[PDB]
Amino acid sequence: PVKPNYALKFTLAGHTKAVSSVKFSPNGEWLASSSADKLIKIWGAYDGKFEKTISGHKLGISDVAWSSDSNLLVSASDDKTLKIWDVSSGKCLKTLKGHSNYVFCCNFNPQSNLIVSGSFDESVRIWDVKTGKCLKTLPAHSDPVSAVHFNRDGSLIVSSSYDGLCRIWDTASGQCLKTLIDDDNPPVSFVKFSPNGKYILAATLDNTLKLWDYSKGKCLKTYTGHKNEKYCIFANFSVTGGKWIVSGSEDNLVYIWNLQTKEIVQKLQGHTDVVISTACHPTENIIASAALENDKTIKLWKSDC
Numbered sequence: 001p002v003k004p005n006y007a008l009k010f011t012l013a014g015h016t017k018a019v020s021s022v023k024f025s026p027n028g029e030w031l032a033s034s035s036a037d038k039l040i041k042i043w044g045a046y047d048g049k050f051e052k053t054i055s056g057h058k059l060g061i062s063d064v065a066w067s068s069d070s071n072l073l074v075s076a077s078d079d080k081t082l083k084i085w086d087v088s089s090g091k092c093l094k095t096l097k098g099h100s101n102y103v104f105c106c107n108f109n110p111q112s113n114l115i116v117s118g119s120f121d122e123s124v125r126i127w128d129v130k131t132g133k134c135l136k137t138l139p140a141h142s143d144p145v146s147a148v149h150f151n152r153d154g155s156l157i158v159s160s161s162y163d164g165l166c167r168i169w170d171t172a173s174g175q176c177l178k179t180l181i182d183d184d185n186p187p188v189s190f191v192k193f194s195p196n197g198k199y200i201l202a203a204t205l206d207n208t209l210k211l212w213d214y215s216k217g218k219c220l221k222t223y224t225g226h227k228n229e230k231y232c233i234f235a236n237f238s239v240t241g242g243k244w245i246v247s248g249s250e251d252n253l254v255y256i257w258n259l260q261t262k263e264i265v266q267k268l269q270g271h272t273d274v275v276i277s278t279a280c281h282p283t284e285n286i287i288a289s290a291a292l293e294n295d296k297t298i299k300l301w302k303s304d305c
């Protein structure tokens with residue numbers, strides 16, 4: 001494929017404040033969304049059909065993530081907690097307490113016995129899913145933590161922060177294995193491992209995304225053309241068809257790049273505020289996007305490649 005042809009199929013209205021994060025369930029059936037309105041919503045991944053609302057946090061929610069079997073969700077809230085939810089019943093199974101400021105980002109490990117979180121309190125915490133207890137507190141950064149992600153076998157965690165650092169952590173020991181910097185130390189607004197686990201995709205608040213080989217510390221690709229100077233915006237590897245990079249943008253568009261050539265191959269227009277979050281369906285060429293307070297809708301876009 002040379003270029004995709006993503007076209008708007010559904011617009012998902014229901015949150016009453018900015019949408020903070022959207023994620024597809026690993027089994028492809030569902031989309032979960034979190035919002036500053038303190039709610040989680042569940043939507044059909046293929047038809048946009050509203051499914052249910054999950055409530056219980058006392059303040060807005062920044063992030064949600066799915067367990068590997070698609071049965072559990074974890075949410076990260078301004079109330080300083082994370083919550084583990086059984087999706088099909090809606091019950092809160094555990095409340096994870098320990099952070100001393102907003103919890104901004106979260107993820108399960110692939111085995112989904114652990115949760116990693118990053119907080120405005122500048123720490124990363126590793127939690128046991130079964131007991132809800134904090135296993136490790138990492139003195140990870142000197143500014144809020146903008147992203148945390150496990151690699152494909154769960155042995156590593158990558159974190160990013162406004163302090164301009166990206167760090168790689170040994171899940172088992174909690175030891176910092178690598179600190180990665182970039183010229184002029186722009187805030188690092190997002191990071192995540194590539195699906196094969198060999199690369200790091202990192203956003204910096206200088207309107208730039210970079211694909212890094214973190215082992216050799218070498219920048220392999222640079223993607224520009226979007227607007228990213230103010231917000232932490234999710235980015236993705238799209239792998240079900242053509243190999244793309246996907247990101248939101250502060251000009252209200254979804255950007256899609258060719259991973260190897262770095263050329264913009266499509267811009268998706270429709271949102272009326274910053275596109276803060278995008279996600280890529282695990283098996284079909286479907287993108288979900290979500291926007292800030294002046295918009296508050298989620299959109300599902302479908303491509304033939």
Ligand SMILES: COc1cc(CN2CCc3c(cc(Cn4ccnc4C)cc3-c3cn(C)nc3C(F)(F)F)C2=O)cc(OC)c1
Pocket residue numbers: 018019020021035036060061062063078104105144145146147162189190230231232233234276277292293
């Ligand atoms: C002190 O300076 C700062 C400023 C900022 C700015 N900041 C704060 C608000 C915010 C931001 C990014 C994302 C997207 N997101 C979430 C998890 N991972 C990602 C990529 C969601 C939200 C958010 C949370 N809630 C409850 N409502 C929202 C919404 F904006 F949608 F209203 C964001 O950029 C961040 C920061 O440290 C991290 C330090």
